[PDB]
Design a protein around this motif. Structure first.
Motif, PDB file in Angstrom:
ATOM      1  N   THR A   1       0.664  -1.099   0.104  1.00 38.89           N
ATOM      2  CA  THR A   1      -0.176   0.146  -0.131  1.00 38.89           C
ATOM      3  C   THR A   1       0.946   1.224  -0.076  1.00 38.89           C
ATOM      4  OG1 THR A   1      -1.598  -1.362   1.163  1.00 38.89           O
ATOM      5  CG2 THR A   1      -1.899   1.129   1.108  1.00 38.89           C
ATOM      6  N   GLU A   2       1.850   1.179   0.827  1.00 40.21           N
ATOM      7  CA  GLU A   2       2.832   2.423   0.836  1.00 40.21           C
ATOM      8  C   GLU A   2       3.370   2.801  -0.533  1.00 40.21           C
ATOM      9  OE1 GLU A   2       3.954   4.842   2.357  1.00 40.21           O
ATOM     10  OE2 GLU A   2       6.103   5.109   1.850  1.00 40.21           O
ATOM     11  N   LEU A   3       3.879   1.503  -1.213  1.00 46.25           N
ATOM     12  CA  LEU A   3       4.266   1.862  -2.577  1.00 46.25           C
ATOM     13  C   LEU A   3       3.411   2.332  -3.583  1.00 46.25           C
ATOM     14  CD1 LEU A   3       6.803  -1.201  -3.370  1.00 46.25           C
ATOM     15  CD2 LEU A   3       7.216   0.980  -2.411  1.00 46.25           C
ATOM     16  N   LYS A   4       2.095   2.061  -3.088  1.00 46.12           N
ATOM     17  CA  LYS A   4       0.962   2.483  -4.106  1.00 46.12           C
ATOM     18  C   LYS A   4       0.697   4.092  -4.114  1.00 46.12           C
ATOM     19  CE  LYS A   4      -3.427   1.965  -5.766  1.00 46.12           C
ATOM     20  NZ  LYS A   4      -4.794   0.790  -6.012  1.00 46.12           N
ATOM     21  N   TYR A   5       0.806   4.341  -2.683  1.00 45.75           N
ATOM     22  CA  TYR A   5       0.283   5.823  -2.213  1.00 45.75           C
ATOM     23  C   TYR A   5       1.434   6.775  -1.637  1.00 45.75           C
ATOM     24  CZ  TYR A   5      -4.593   3.945  -2.656  1.00 45.75           C
ATOM     25  OH  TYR A   5      -5.630   3.321  -3.339  1.00 45.75           O
ATOM     26  N   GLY A   6       2.317   5.893  -1.406  1.00 47.33           N
ATOM     27  CA  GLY A   6       3.460   6.764  -0.756  1.00 47.33           C
ATOM     28  C   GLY A   6       4.299   7.725  -1.774  1.00 47.33           C
ATOM     29  N   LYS A   7       4.513   8.899  -1.049  1.00 45.33           N
ATOM     30  CA  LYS A   7       5.439   9.831  -1.904  1.00 45.33           C
ATOM     31  C   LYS A   7       7.003   9.944  -1.315  1.00 45.33           C
ATOM     32  CE  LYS A   7       1.559  11.269  -4.006  1.00 45.33           C
ATOM     33  NZ  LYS A   7       1.092  12.702  -3.506  1.00 45.33           N
ATOM     34  N   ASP A   8       6.987   9.652  -0.217  1.00 48.10           N
ATOM     35  CA  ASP A   8       8.429   9.863   0.580  1.00 48.10           C
ATOM     36  C   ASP A   8       9.381   8.750   0.106  1.00 48.10           C
ATOM     37  OD1 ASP A   8      10.427   9.042   2.555  1.00 48.10           O
ATOM     38  OD2 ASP A   8      10.023  11.038   3.047  1.00 48.10           O
ATOM     39  N   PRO A   9      10.490   9.173  -0.458  1.00 47.18           N
ATOM     40  CA  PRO A   9      11.605   8.036  -1.053  1.00 47.18           C
ATOM     41  C   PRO A   9      12.054   7.171   0.024  1.00 47.18           C
ATOM     42  CG  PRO A   9      12.408  10.138  -1.172  1.00 47.18           C
ATOM     43  CD  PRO A   9      11.026  10.235  -0.551  1.00 47.18           C
ATOM     44  N   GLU A  10      12.254   7.691   1.162  1.00 46.50           N
ATOM     45  CA  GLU A  10      12.840   6.931   2.210  1.00 46.50           C
ATOM     46  C   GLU A  10      12.067   5.674   2.603  1.00 46.50           C
ATOM     47  OE1 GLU A  10      14.657   9.187   5.562  1.00 46.50           O
ATOM     48  OE2 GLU A  10      14.740   7.199   6.698  1.00 46.50           O
ATOM     49  N   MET A  11      10.967   6.137   2.930  1.00 47.37           N
ATOM     50  CA  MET A  11       9.811   4.980   3.335  1.00 47.37           C
ATOM     51  C   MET A  11       9.388   4.133   2.329  1.00 47.37           C
ATOM     52  SD  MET A  11       9.261   5.296   6.596  1.00 47.37           S
ATOM     53  CE  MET A  11      10.979   5.716   6.571  1.00 47.37           C
ATOM     54  N   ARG A  12       9.237   4.599   1.326  1.00 41.64           N
ATOM     55  CA  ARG A  12       9.079   3.713  -0.035  1.00 41.64           C
ATOM     56  C   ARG A  12      10.204   2.673  -0.176  1.00 41.64           C
ATOM     57  NH1 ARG A  12       8.885   5.074  -4.545  1.00 41.64           N
ATOM     58  NH2 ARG A  12       6.998   3.750  -5.335  1.00 41.64           N
ATOM     59  N   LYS A  13      11.439   3.285  -0.010  1.00 47.34           N
ATOM     60  CA  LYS A  13      12.586   2.501   0.105  1.00 47.34           C
ATOM     61  C   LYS A  13      12.410   1.242   1.222  1.00 47.34           C
ATOM     62  CE  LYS A  13      16.315   0.430  -0.883  1.00 47.34           C
ATOM     63  NZ  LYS A  13      16.132  -0.474  -2.060  1.00 47.34           N
ATOM     64  N   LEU A  14      12.041   1.668   2.347  1.00 42.25           N
ATOM     65  CA  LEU A  14      11.901   0.881   3.560  1.00 42.25           C
ATOM     66  C   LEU A  14      10.868  -0.213   3.342  1.00 42.25           C
ATOM     67  CD1 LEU A  14      12.578  -0.449   6.361  1.00 42.25           C
ATOM     68  CD2 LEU A  14      11.373   1.668   7.471  1.00 42.25           C
ATOM     69  N   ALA A  15       9.813   0.210   2.663  1.00 40.92           N
ATOM     70  CA  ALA A  15       8.685  -0.884   2.267  1.00 40.92           C
ATOM     71  C   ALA A  15       9.025  -1.734   1.157  1.00 40.92           C
ATOM     72  CB  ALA A  15       7.541   0.171   1.642  1.00 40.92           C
ATOM     73  N   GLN A  16      10.023  -1.329   0.488  1.00 37.26           N
ATOM     74  CA  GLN A  16      10.515  -2.322  -0.407  1.00 37.26           C
ATOM     75  C   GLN A  16      11.488  -3.557   0.169  1.00 37.26           C
ATOM     76  OE1 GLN A  16      12.610  -0.016  -3.421  1.00 37.26           O
ATOM     77  NE2 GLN A  16      10.617   0.102  -4.808  1.00 37.26           N
ATOM     78  N   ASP A  17      12.238  -2.839   1.069  1.00 36.21           N
ATOM     79  CA  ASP A  17      13.221  -3.648   1.811  1.00 36.21           C
ATOM     80  C   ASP A  17      12.315  -4.744   2.649  1.00 36.21           C
ATOM     81  OD1 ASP A  17      15.348  -2.313   0.605  1.00 36.21           O
ATOM     82  OD2 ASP A  17      15.592  -1.174   2.478  1.00 36.21           O
TER      83      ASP A  17
END
Ligand SMILES: [Cu+]
Ligand SMILES: [Cu+]
Ligand SMILES: [Cu+]
Ligand SMILES: [Cu+]
Ligand SMILES: [Cu+]
Lengths: 85, 92
Positions: free
Chosen positions: A49-65
């Motif tokens: 969900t964060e990868l779909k709606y998130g804008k912040d790169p650091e958190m989107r990075k953490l979500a991928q990890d």
């Protein structure tokens, strides 16, 4: 906007369903495996969900990890269940 | 099949407690409008549940492989919790 909150909520109620069925387990090793698997699947859902709606790169990075790692630990607990008790 | 087995062991009770706690904190965290902030607060509460479930496993569990995983999970989740915590204290 609120669409993100529901997708988050959907993954949560989804995790709660399976986690509920896993704690009535009596063997605590089996309970940990089954419960943490459902718990880990919840992380993956919340991270996607964060990868779909998130804008912040650091958190989107953490979500991928988090998706990569949790998926790994899940396959381990699954193999542990196919052989044990 | 046994009637006295209609009550949960202490281990199942601790597991149940960690879930009800995790759900509460996660409920209060989705109230975010910003989805990045919502992901942080939610995954933090979700991660703390992992620690609780792993600690419960370390208390009652006997299997070496799973006990090792519980130990590692506590380390990793706490780290990622610190990352999201600092991310929340630094981003607006
Ligand atoms: Cu998990
Ligand atoms: Cu009771
Ligand atoms: Cu709820
Ligand atoms: Cu988590
Ligand atoms: Cu074994």
């Amino acid at each position: 906007s609120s669409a993100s909150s529901q997708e988050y909520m959907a993954g949560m109620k989804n995790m709660h369903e399976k986690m509920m069925a896993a704690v009535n387990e009596s063997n605590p090793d089996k309970a940990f495996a089954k419960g943490m698997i459902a718990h880990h699947e919840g992380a993956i859902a919340m991270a996607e969900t964060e990868l779909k709606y998130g804008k912040d790169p650091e958190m989107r990075k953490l979500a991928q990890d988090i998706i990569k790692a949790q998926k790994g630990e899940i396959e381990q607990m699954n193999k542990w269940l196919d052989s044990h008790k």
